[PDB]
């Protein structure tokens, strides 16, 4: 199968500024019929993939002129003259010259915005999870940027790395921020053998770590 | 215009066969075009699987040929994907699409998990806090397979909501969702987490009660 390679895998762009993606194929995409069936596809968070470009440079219906495709043979480019927030998502180049049709490795476009500190919130095990004999401690880190962040769980001052489930939302096109969930799963009995539960986040927006903490013997 | 809508079993046992339906609305699949199945693996890789054209002619990705078939029912305006000898590696989001013949429009996709693990309903826990804003949470734990649907106040609360992708831990999924409102909105105005797990026919409504 024809291999499609994209560069870069990641793109961070300011609104109103140009963005571009390179695509390369393992062999020429120029068909015997004289045409080059190179396509571009956009997948926004929470939406179906959507056609942007076909035949290297032809615009699909509803696609703004801001999008521009070019290239030939094995080398192709997608250019967005003026980036808007709705442009964030994952971008795929793919070829339809050769059978089977094949897709390239995606490029993720993120909207570069001003730095924003995380809203950090800690949650002791719910009175419902505890009664049922369970104990999960949860830390939300909401609406921050950039994505770079350090989050540590400390139980009785001791850093925990086992049983820590971290999950990230896609960048929110409404505020260009990220949010992350951190969950430490214990048992009812282990939770009861410790006192202090601390979520500590390090982010460039603050010189001191953002710390949320609770003590069992105070709830 | 044309609407595409995928449907089928969300969980199939290894070695058995996968069966998916794409229901088309607004246009007869017999009129024109090629009707494709494409799948997206965890990690977002896309693979074209094959198509059936308006005449009923099929074409399959050579990597799957001995294992795949695409058929149709012109009376129902549907076409179908059939994938045999499935393994966990066949776990993916399956999309139907159409083009002339290169795909031009895509469906919403449907998740298909291939595994021997058993269906398990989720436990749903309300996360109440211990600033100007206040964050509430919902913890959906120990379910299988994906997906669940989660809403706040039966969907009437959508702003300030962050629903995090499920993480698979020990053949069980955990998912969480947060909602942020003004500090003087809750608990004066009640907030409830609604979780549906179609696989187990589960539907839970858990109100976020403030802690003592």
């Amino acid at each position: 199968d024809v291999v499609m390679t994209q560069t870069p895998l990641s793109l961070s762009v300011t609104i109103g500024q140009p963005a571009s993606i390179s695509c390369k194929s393992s062999q020429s995409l120029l068909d015997s019929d004289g045409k080059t069936y190179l396509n571009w596809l956009l997948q926004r968070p929470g939406q179906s993939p959507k056609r942007l470009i076909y035949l290297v440079s032809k615009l699909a219906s509803g696609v703004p002129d801001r999008f521009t495709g070019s290239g030939s043979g094995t080398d192709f480019t997608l250019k967005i003259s003026r980036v808007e927030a709705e442009d964030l998502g994952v971008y795929y180049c793919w070829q339809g010259t050769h059978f089977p049709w094949t897709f390239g490795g995606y490029t993720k476009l993120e909207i570069k915005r001003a730095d924003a500190a995380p809203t950090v919130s800690i949650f002791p095990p719910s009175s419902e999870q505890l009664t049922s004999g369970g104990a999960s401690v949860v830390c939300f880190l909401n609406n921050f940027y950039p994505k770079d962040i350090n989050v540590k769980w400390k139980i009785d001052g001791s850093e925990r790395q086992n049983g820590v489930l971290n999950s990230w939302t896609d960048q929110d096109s409404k505020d260009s921020t990220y949010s992350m969930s951190s969950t430490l799963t214990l048992t009812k009995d282990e939770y009861e053998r410790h006192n202090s539960y601390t979520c500590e986040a390090t982010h460039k927006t603050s010189t001191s770590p953002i710390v949320k903490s609770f003590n069992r013997n105070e709830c | 215009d044309v609407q595409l809508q995928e449907s089928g079993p969300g969980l199939v046992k290894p070695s058995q066969s996968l069966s998916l339906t794409c229901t088309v609305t607004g246009y007869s699949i017999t009129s024109d075009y090629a009707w494709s199945w494409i799948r997206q693996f965890p990690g977002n890789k896309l693979e074209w699987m094959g198509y059936i054209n308006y005449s009923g002619y099929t074409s399959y990705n050579p990597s799957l040929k001995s294992r795949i078939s695409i058929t149709r029912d012109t009376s129902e305006n549907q076409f179908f994907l059939q994938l045999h000898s499935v393994t966990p590696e066949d776990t993916a989001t399956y999309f139907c699409a159409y083009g002339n013949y290169l795909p031009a429009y895509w469906g919403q996709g449907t998740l298909v998990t291939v595994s021997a693990a058993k269906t398990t309903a989720p436990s749903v826990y309300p996360l109440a806090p211990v600033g100007s804003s206040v964050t509430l949470g919902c913890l959906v734990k120990g379910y299988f397979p994906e997906p669940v649907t989660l809403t706040w106040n039966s969907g009437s609360l959508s702003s300030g909501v962050h629903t995090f992708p499920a993480v698979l831990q020990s053949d069980l999924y955990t998912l969480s969702s947060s909602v942020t409102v003004t500090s003087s909105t809750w608990p004066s105005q009640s907030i409830t987490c609604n979780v549906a797990h179609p696989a187990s026919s589960t539907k839970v409504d858990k109100k976020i009660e403030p802690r003592g």
């Binding site: 068909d31 032809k58 010259t97 | 002339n100």
Partner: peptide, 7 residues
């Protein structure tokens, strides 16, 4: 939709 080589 415009016709491509496969159509």
């Amino acid at each position: 939709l415009e016709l491509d080589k496969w159509a």
